[model samples]
Target chain A: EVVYRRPEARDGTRVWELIRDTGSLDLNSPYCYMLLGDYFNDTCMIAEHEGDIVGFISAFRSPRNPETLFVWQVAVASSHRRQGIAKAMLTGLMNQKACHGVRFIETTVSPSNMASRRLFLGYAEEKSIPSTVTVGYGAEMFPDGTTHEDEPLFVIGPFFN
Target chain B: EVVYRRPEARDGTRVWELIRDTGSLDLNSPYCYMLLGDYFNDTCMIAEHEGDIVGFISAFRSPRNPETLFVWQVAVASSHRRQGIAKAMLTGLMNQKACHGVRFIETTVSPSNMASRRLFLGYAEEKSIPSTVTVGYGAEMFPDGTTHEDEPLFVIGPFFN
Candidate 1:
């Protein structure tokens, strides 16, 4: 069984393993240590199973718009697939934001990935992230030969009472 | 003489004209439009001179973190160079925050451009942006046949005393 928890300092090595072991969790933009560091430093939650980390998600509210939380990254271990770990973790994040004063959440996913697309759409209201295509600012390649621009961003709203 | 004012509906076409006439402006980056739009949407300001648009600055408090005001854009017309228009605009933005409960203004600047670097660092504290050098993050191709990796982003913050 997977236990959902806030990431602690000691979980570093295991978290690294989860990302490194999965060769292309999101083939388009494989996870990066720096991104994990930012997530942990900014806002995040993780899932661990029997001392082996299985998945994690990072989120941050827009600096200018505090009520809106931006879901930066989400990854789940392959062996633990078909489970509801991602959903549970995301739900936890939304609930935990009360203290932070977050009333909304936004995220991006690959348009082609049915699982992820459905996961986000089912969990959050579906809204078309108007493309910034005309600006010529599309998928960007990082040093790791990965593209991040393909991730379609989505927003989930002011949690009502 | 330079005059700073809030943009009105009448200035929409002129604003676009100024942006377009300044072919040097990086229209590809929505940074400018986002800034201008914010000012138009909220309590923002713009700068004009000699009956023409010269430079403009826009900002707003982070809804999540009320203490921080995100500086959206600060563009000066190339034709109206070195006239302190940018500084005047920034001053106006910083001043407007007092009533809105803003404590600090923050902005990001790419490392390459010495001019912008100097401008930002001149009035604020420069902090090394926390970013990880990943494999597939930022790559750009300029029209001048200049291809470069977009790294070393820096954040600048001006605290209102």
Candidate 2:
């Protein structure tokens, strides 16, 4: 059994916890507490099963780039596998077009995550935007306590039809 | 006379001070502080004359996008006009190619700001991109409780001689 609902400010911590556990496959890089705190108040949703959060999705509509809703993250817990929770969340979000003023939705997938690759492509058209990249540091710290060099890759996105 | 120097962690308060005074301009719209406190360290710069900060240039080299350096903000104190502080700070950063892996610099300017427009275009060629269209409110919000909106405009850069 799964319950779908909108997130409120207080739920930010739990959502962030899920995000942190998911690691580098972040919905967005630079996931600060502040970012999560704000997402709760603005544009995001979560999945609850048996009164506990099993997955979440985050997004922001760009006022400067109004035609697209940038989906930051979508994650489902390992315990809640194959439940169609992720699709429900994404489709539910797409259906809220009028309120969000979003005509298109876009999200990036790491080359390594075939599960996510198949998931997003199932709903929207997948296109490879080669040579385009996103830069961010690793979870590990150097001996000097600074972050190591950023990891770059070819990213694919699922564009709405 | 203007002296260009990078900002240290100690300079956070001063930078915030200038941003606060310019609150009418809403300089914090992009949520720059995330990079400021994290990745940028002290590479961000400030312009000063006679011990008073007249302008600032803050940027961070993206670990994921090594070829790009995003300018978080470049602001000149309102009272210190005609001194070319903003221009100097930008030029100084551009010159950092020798010291940093910075190749392309990117920043946003509200369409209404002619002064900022002239200053940026004077130094770099502007890319012709569509203007931002405000579709609606973003589902995500910032730490400061502000939501993102679409305000489309061409990103300007590739500055070189």
Candidate 3:
């Protein structure tokens, strides 16, 4: 059975490794994970199966919009893909007491990431929450004509529960 | 003469008053301004003309992307509009020592807000920085099908100075 719980500082290294292994998520410094695991632990989550970390989600409330939770990243280990682990972890996070007042969830996904698009749309449909997609980050935002993909913002909101 | 400076707790009410007077900006509670002035003062800025607060820009650095500064709101009093005060305050904030190392600036502008679009685009032009705009928030993100304007995210970046 997979256990979903808040992440701890000790899980930082593993989280970093998991993100690196995923090869799609941005590779932030281990110290970033450490800070998130320690300072923003309430918003960061980890999925552990038999004492091994297999999935993780990093998120935080928008300071300007307390009711909105901005999901920074969602990563599931390659070995654990397509098992509904990402959805399970997201549901667990949204249902947690720490996120009690959250009425909306927001995240940015690349236009080419079909898997992520489906995952988020599925979540909105299952929850019956209205969602919208629009360009969040343009490719030109990067310097040096960098090859950053355009990110579409997905916002799901007004959860009654 | 207009003086540009960091916001202080005392400026909260005036800032709120200024935003309200703008009629186009979203009005946040006075407490929100207070928190921005206190905790995020380093990034938030205010413009004063003849000892009265006439313009303000509330922004904060993204924790995950330390080099990028996300501007939440930029409001200049009606009477002060067209004087380039908005750009002045923005340039002032970006030039502050507190904002050193900031290589990118980001903000969202509604499609109909041509003035705001010009404001940001003008900043990029004056500074000779590259900029790009893409949709940031869509109407469906709101609970009401109430004609919510689409906000395009404008990003200006990679300043040499």
Candidate 4:
């Protein structure tokens, strides 16, 4: 059995652990997860199964465009995959009052990321909205000096909130 | 006379307009202010004078360190200057439950930004705590092709909350 709910500050450390295990997602500081859980929790979600945090999604209303929600990171524990938990969390995250006016969704996905690519495209399909891929950040812009990937922007929207 | 209170989403646009007029502080989107007012309101403050937006301060608990609060931006309407409203807002902001355990304050100030430099240093003095100035971002890192300034980091704290 699994439960979907908004996150809290205390759950941040656990959420960080879940994201860390994903391995493919970028690892941020514990503080980042805590802030997302505490301040941005209305736009975020957590899936817990049997006392363990198994799924997490982070998003925020775009600072430049409030009608847009920029999905930051989505992670599901390996043990809990193939359960459609990520899609469930995404749907529930937008049901909050804080997301009342959101009309679009945006995210940057690295090329060859099959799981994430399918997740976003599938989400757009479920919403019955159009999703377009556009130019975003190039690997040279990273400045991280590590193995990098081209992150193309994906825009899904114009749907009624 | 001015009254200090936590900001709400309705005040976000007014706060954005206020920052645009300062001619010194960076102007962020109205959405950014709204998020602060709604989610991070516990760490933010606004000064209202006769129903006009007179002052604003934005801050958040440091993601890397829960005990440290990072002050983002502080703005005051030009017509309402010299009343010590900024200092007053900072005091009331810390009194919130969200900031109860906070023991440090951090911010970045550009050289020749006398008003801000004095404000943070003066706040440190009032709290009877030591303040340290160190290297931060430089003009070269901006890459915005506009006139830029070197931002120096200032840390104040270890004070008992």
Best by TM-score: 4
DockQ of each: 0.04, 0.04, 0.03, 0.04
DockQ-superior candidate, 1 or 3: 1
Candidate 4 accuracy as TM-score: 0.55
Docking class of 4: incorrect
Model 2 chain B: lowest-lDDT 10 consecutive positions: B129-138
DockQ of 2: 0.04
Ranked by lDDT, the better of candidates 1 and 3 is: 3
Superior candidate under TM-score, 2 versus 4: 4
TM-score of chain A of each: 0.71, 0.68, 0.93, 0.93
lDDT-better candidate, 2 vs 4? 4
What ranges in model 2 sit over 4 Å off? A1-161, B24-43, B97-101, B125-153, B157-161
The lDDT per prediction is: 0.54, 0.55, 0.75, 0.77
Q: For residue A51, what is the lDDT in candidate 2?
A: 78
After superposition, candidate 4 runs with Cα above 4 Å error: A1-161
Candidate 3: tens digits of C-alpha lDDT, residues A1-161: 88888887556667878887876665654534654675567788899897778999988776556688878788998888899899888887787675357788888888777777888899999878899998665555433423567666788988765
* Least accurate 10 contiguous residues by lDDT in model 3 chain A: A137-146
Any runs in candidate 1 off by more than 4 Å, and if so which?
A: A23-42, A100-102, A125-137, A140-149, B1-161
Of the candidates shown, which would achieve the greatest lDDT relative to the real structure?
Answer: 4
Which pairs of residues collide in model 3?
A135-B135
